[PDB]
């Protein structure tokens, strides 16, 4: 459907995701824990009844009317985790997630308030800038003709090098600033 690595969903992935969404919407339907745990083993039995189905077209049809079953029996407001998308605390602290380059725009009177921090940030940036051209020339010889096929990136191969396209993943803001 829409994924970074694969261009599709395998049938095994579709079965597992439908099982998970069915259990989550079921737990939304079935608030109490022993009651949900009873119906959860019942639903696990219903999913393991046709676990050993060899015919992929028949399993496709069974998965399709299982999606119809799940859509007919879904909860209108299922339990979303608070920091899950659709939750009450979701993306709440994104107004506190200042990007790191703004530290470069500080005045030197407040840069001198934290001397060890910026004295270490200088060699962090030094590390980034002497890693950049090596990881660019790493990516230019491994990428096939026509660009990269999948969005996944190779790791650091040599010893001493850093993995390519790493600075915004490493220096990302904390989830609770």
């Amino acid at each position: 459907a829409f994924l970074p690595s694969a261009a599709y969903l395998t049938h095994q992935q579709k079965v597992l995701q439908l099982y998970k969404r069915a259990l989550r919407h079921l737990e939304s339907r079935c608030v109490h824990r022993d009651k949900y745990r009873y119906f959860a083993c019942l639903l696990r039995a219903r999913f393991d009844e046709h676990k050993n189905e060899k015919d992929m077209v028949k399993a496709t049809q069974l998965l399709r009317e299982a999606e119809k079953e799940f859509w007919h029996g879904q909860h209108p407001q299922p339990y979303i985790f608070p920091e899950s998308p659709g939750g009450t605390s979701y993306e709440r602290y994104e107004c506190y997630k200042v990007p790191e380059w703004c530290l470069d725009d500080w005045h030197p009177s407040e840069k001198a308030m934290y001397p060890d921090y910026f004295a270490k940030r200088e060699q962090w940036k030094k590390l980034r800038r002497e890693s950049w051209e090596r990881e660019v020339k790493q990516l230019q010889e491994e990428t096939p003709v026509g660009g990269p096929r999948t969005e996944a990136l190779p790791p650091a191969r040599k010893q001493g090098d850093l993995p390519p396209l790493w600075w915004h993943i490493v220096t990302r803001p904390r989830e609770r600033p």
Binding site: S28, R29, V31, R33, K35, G73, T88, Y90, E91, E94
Partner: protein, 558 residues
């Protein structure tokens, strides 16, 4: 005399002094939230003296102290009306706000913008006491738009979150649709009565006052979340908990009800306005209480609770009983602020968990929170001789015994039962039973800020109805003669609601899985009203705002 007006103005100037303090800052503060809480405590103490010397003699006055403008026949002066409504609302609002800020010094302690939060909350308090003390329509429009904009700024407090900005713009939209009717009322009074002052409106006493009262009913619809312009009050739970506690339960959302209580000599001589208020209030108190039966977010459930109580306030205005409605405002503030504070104490204890389906077992884990939540729910439902008994039951004791729309009365009683249903639903899923929250227990409430802040509103929710209703003078005649099946109406309907919802709650322990009914899908998706109109009315605007407005006409043809 010289004491009353002086301390009246001292209260408002004292509320404005920390705004000058936070604007004239150079240092980092020696606990500016404690400074604002101390200031609002002392402003409460200051406003107590004019209230006591009003209860002594009935002393009302007007302070038209500063001449501001004269548009040829309209002398707009800075004019403060100290009547019964201001003398009962200002100490209640300052007391509730003082408890909300001692709550917020615990709840909002992790926020690095805590000084901006207390600044915005004080700005809201200033605009609200501008609203409830204004003597002309213009200063009331100042306070009206002020509480609308501080509602925007306190819904969108976590401004990075898309849903908070969406709910804040939604609330601004519905409030400005109410402002259409408020400006309609100002336009009618300026053209036909040559005034925005309340005194000349009341002294001229017009007879063809259907159109300004329709404007005021549309204003109260936009402001008090009546039906048609309601869903922003459930959407506005995306802001922080003391925001929803102070503003959107007890203080801001009563301002449309306060606008209609303020204009009672026009409504008491217009039966059509009374009938429209009765029908709209009964529709809202049915619909929001029905939507509250099948929700799982606790802030949503208590917001539907406060909107159903606002619909009941609109009902008891619509039976020409405005002073009972205002007694219900002053009563409702205590236990509804306390219910939001206890719900948010559960939320902060359970690590930002708001969904009631992952709560439970909190009767002995959070004992003080459980005690105060039960007391707030019982004051909401109409337990005998709590604070919510001293107004709401009397509302039913005047809703039965009056020349009333019969279906509005029957929907009022269905709402009275539904209040008991969602109250014991909150107590069932959140306090009773066995735990459903995750495994790392960080449950704690032993801060004197939280405990004292819930404690003072607990003293309010126990004693304040008795104290106020024995300190207010009669302004109507209380209808006290009725048959015994009619006197025992509200209590029996409330207990029937408790019994029906206890049977509903004990059908959930059974090991059965039923398919969802159409009533459950209707009430859970909010009467289908925020699902359709929030999609359709923007769509039909914005395509029309692009295809024909921008592209076709104003880039090609014209």
């Amino acid at each position: 005399m010289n004491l009353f007006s002086s301390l009246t103005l001292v209260t408002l100037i004292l509320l404005t002094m920390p705004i000058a303090a936070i604007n004239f800052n150079t240092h980092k503060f020696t606990n500016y939230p404690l400074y604002v809480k101390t200031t609002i405590s002392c402003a409460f103490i200051t406003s107590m003296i004019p209230t006591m010397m009003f209860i002594h003699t009935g002393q009302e006055m007007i302070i038209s102290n500063w001449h501001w403008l004269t548009i040829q026949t309209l002398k707009l002066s800075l004019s403060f009306k100290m009547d019964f409504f201001s003398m009962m609302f200002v100490p209640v609002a300052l007391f509730v706000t003082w408890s909300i800020m001692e709550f917020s010094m615990w709840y909002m302690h992790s926020d690095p913008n805590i000084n901006q939060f207390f600044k915005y909350l004080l700005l809201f308090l200033i605009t609200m006491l501008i609203l409830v003390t204004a003597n002309n329509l213009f200063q009331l429009f100042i306070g009206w738009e002020g509480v609308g904009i501080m509602s925007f700024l306190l819904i969108g407090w976590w401004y990075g979150r898309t849903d908070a900005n969406t709910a804040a713009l939604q609330a601004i939209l519905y409030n400005r649709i109410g402002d259409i009717g408020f400006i309609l009322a100002m336009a009618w009074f300026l053209i036909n009565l040559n005034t925005w002052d309340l005194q000349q409106i009341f002294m001229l006493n017009p007879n063809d006052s259907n159109l300004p009262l329709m404007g005021l009913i549309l204003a109260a619809t936009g402001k008090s979340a009546q039906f048609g312009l309601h869903p922003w009050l459930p959407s506005a739970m995306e802001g922080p908990t003391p925001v929803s506690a102070l503003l959107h339960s007890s203080t801001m959302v009563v301002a449309g009800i306060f606008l209609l209580i303020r204009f009672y000599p026009l409504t008491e001589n217009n039966k059509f306005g009374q009938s429209i208020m009765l029908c709209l209030g009964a529709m809202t108190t049915l619909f929001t209480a029905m939507c509250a039966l099948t929700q799982n977010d606790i802030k949503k459930i208590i917001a539907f609770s406060t909107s159903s109580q606002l619909g009941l306030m609109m009902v008891t205005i619509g039976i020409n009983q405005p002073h009972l409605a205002f007694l219900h405002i002053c009563t409702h503030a205590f236990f509804k602020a306390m219910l939001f504070m206890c719900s948010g104490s559960i939320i902060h204890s359970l690590n930002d968990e708001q969904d009631i389906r992952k709560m439970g077992g909190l009767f002995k884990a959070m004992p003080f929170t459980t005690t105060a939540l039960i007391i707030g729910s019982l004051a909401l439902t109409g337990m005998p001789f709590l604070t919510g008994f001293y107004s709401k039951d009397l509302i039913i004791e005047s809703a039965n015994t009056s020349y009333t729309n019969a279906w509005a009365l029957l929907m009022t009683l269905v709402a009275t039962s539904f209040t008991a249903i969602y109250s014991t639903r909150i107590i069932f899923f959140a306090l009773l039973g066995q735990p459903r929250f995750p495994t790392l227990i960080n449950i704690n409430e032993n801060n004197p800020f939280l405990i004292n802040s819930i404690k003072r509103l607990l003293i309010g929710s126990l004693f304040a109805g008795f104290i106020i209703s024995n300190n207010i003078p009669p302004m109507t005649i209380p209808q006290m003669t009725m048959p015994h099946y009619l006197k025992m109406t509200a209590l029996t309907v409330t207990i029937l609601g408790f019994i029906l919802a206890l049977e509903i709650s004990n059908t959930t322990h059974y090991l059965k899985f039923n398919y969802p009914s159409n009533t459950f899908k209707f009430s859970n998706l909010l009467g289908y009203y925020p699902t359709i109109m929030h999609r359709l009315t923007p769509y039909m605007n914005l395509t029309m705002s692009q295809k024909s407005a921008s592209s076709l006409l104003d880039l090609i043809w014209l």
